[PDB]
Amino acid sequence: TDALKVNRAPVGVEPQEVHKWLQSFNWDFKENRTKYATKYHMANQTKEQFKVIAKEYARMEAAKDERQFGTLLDGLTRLGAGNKVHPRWGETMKVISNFLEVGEYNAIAASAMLWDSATAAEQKNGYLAQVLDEIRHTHQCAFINHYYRRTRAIGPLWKGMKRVFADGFISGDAVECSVNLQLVGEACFTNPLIVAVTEWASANGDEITPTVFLSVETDELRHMANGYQTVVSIANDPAAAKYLNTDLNNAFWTQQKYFTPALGYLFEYGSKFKVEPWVKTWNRWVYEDWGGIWIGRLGKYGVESPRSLRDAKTDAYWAHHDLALAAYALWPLGFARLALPDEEDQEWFEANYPGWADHYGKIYNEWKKLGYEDPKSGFIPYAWLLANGHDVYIDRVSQVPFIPSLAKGSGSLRVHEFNGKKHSLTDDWGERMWLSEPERYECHNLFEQYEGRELSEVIAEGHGVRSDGKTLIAQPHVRGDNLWTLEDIKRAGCVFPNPLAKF
């Protein structure tokens, strides 16, 4: 009888039990499809690798945060005591954390866009879970950066950073944005990156980046599944055979254009201790592991290695040394303190990049001689650059600086004029992007925003001066002696040109 008999064994409801029916939560109506422009249709029956409902998500992540935040506090108090970290890595930390926050924030919106693109509840759920993860981690960065805004927009690296970490994630076909975010961004560069930084940072006494980065590493398998499900959900769409490999190749080129020189500059110039030279690393991550093995296993769904992979390899040998020239030549526009390679840095460089000494080694030596580090020298190495015909250009598409007279890399200048405006492009893949799609690529470079202004007023307007009011955040050295102030920059009498005036 109902009122008396029943099973009184203890029972709950486990999450995979509620996840079994999640797919059926969606229903058919004619307007039921993504609001964003796309060439593809993610298939309505695609599945999610993890059977996680909202309550289970909260339970698993509340648990991690429990001890992870505890460990993070302990790391911050221990670092608040001693000298701790080596100074050079101490600077690379501030840049790493500032860039990470940008990317984790924009990833929130890229993942939301992807959730909108899917029609299966399960694939929506997978994307949703990455939204929540990117949120958790931006909050970790708020906490971190709270101890350590218009001051980073001043520089020239921040702009390239903004393509591969921000605009590339959210502006385009959602599929192309997935390739920027998961299939290339995370699978090829950042997931390998965060485990490697764990060793490099730890070797410089930085406890905080390993802690934060390992916490991020806990989640990446879900992000790589999201990337995979993008490709899978569209592999039966005839649009895929037509388009997927162009979107992939273009997005692979966008990501490698910034990270190939950027990361190598980070590792080899932002650390004293060097685990192994970046060019061998690059060829292992990108060419062999990502391009060989992983993309190889995606051929199942009609994915082919980027046709531009071989150009990318050709550039990986010197690109980060070229970029380092530009960063050193422009230090007053940045937000961290640079260190010229010391005597063993040079030895290591020559050892691993035969030719480094005859080229970059001598330039930096001459800059040191001409007063690179001396705040009484009124010397700005960008001026020496112009004053010896070594102009700096900015790729209209990628935003990566290019110095054709000093570059040992594989990029070449193309200066075009369209409808009354001159544009500089620096490789064959960017130039096709801009020729095919001018209206996607109108980003002003700094030479245009700051034209014919003195260097010091640009810095000062940007707030790149310490609480002091006169001493620059940026510095050409890492010692606590002989610091540069606005006056010392102004002495140089540096005024931005238009590098395309001569054409």
- Residue 72: closest CA among 220, 212, 204, 217: 212
List binding-site positions for Fe(3+).
104, 134, 137, 186, 220, 223
Residues near 325 by Cβ (< 8 Å), separated by ≥ 6? Answer: 360, 363, 403, 406
C-alpha to C-alpha distance for 461 and 441, rounded to whole angstroms: 27
Q: Residue count at the site for another protein (CB under 8 A)?
A: 156
Q: Is 462 helix (H, G, I), strand (E, B) or coil?
A: coil
Residue given tokens 């592991």 in the structure block: 289
What does 70 bind: Fe ion, another protein, a second copy, none (CB cut-off 5 to 8 Å by kind)? Answer: a second copy
Instruction: By CB under 8 A, tell whether 195 contacts another protein.
Output: yes
DSSP type of residue 444: P
C-alpha to C-alpha distance for 227 and 301, rounded to whole angstroms: 13
- Report the run of H or E that residue 229 belongs to, with start and end: helix 220-234
Instruction: By CB under 8 A, tell whether 81 contacts a second copy.
Output: no
Instruction: By CB under 8 A, tell whether 408 contacts another protein.
Output: no
- Choosing from 141, 177, 188, 494, which is the catalytic residue? 141
- 292-351 binders of another protein (CB under 8 A): 293-294, 297, 307
C-alpha to C-alpha distance for 180 and 178, rounded to whole angstroms: 5
Of 132-140, 224-232, 306-314, 410-418, the window that binds Fe ion (rule: CB under 5 A) is: 132-140
Q: Are strands 393-394 and 421-425 parallel, antiparallel or unpaired?
A: unpaired
Q: Which residue is nearest to Fe ion (CB)?
A: 223
Asked if 141 is an active-site residue, the reply is: yes
Least Cβ distance, residue 299 to another protein (angstroms):
13
Question: For residue 401, which phi and psi values (nearest 5 degrees)?
Answer: -60, 150
Q: Which of 71, 218, 412, 436 binds a second copy (CB under 8 A)?
A: 71
Show the binding pattern over residues 24-63: x = contacts a second copy (CB under 8 A), - = does not: ----------------------------------------
List binding-site positions.
104, 134, 137, 186, 220, 223
Closest CB to another protein among 121 and 325?
121
Residue given tokens 């260097």 in the structure block: 455
- Break positions in the chain: residue before each gap, C to N over 2.5 angstroms: 148
Instruction: By CB under 8 A, tell whether 70 contacts a second copy.
Output: yes
Q: Are strands 414-418 and 393-394 parallel, antiparallel or unpaired?
A: unpaired
- 70-129 binders of Fe ion (CB under 5 A): 104, 107
Q: Name the site residues for a second copy (rule: CB under 8 A).
A: 66-67, 70-71, 73-74
Q: Name the site residues for Fe ion (rule: CB under 5 A).
A: 104, 107, 134, 186, 223
Active site residues: 141
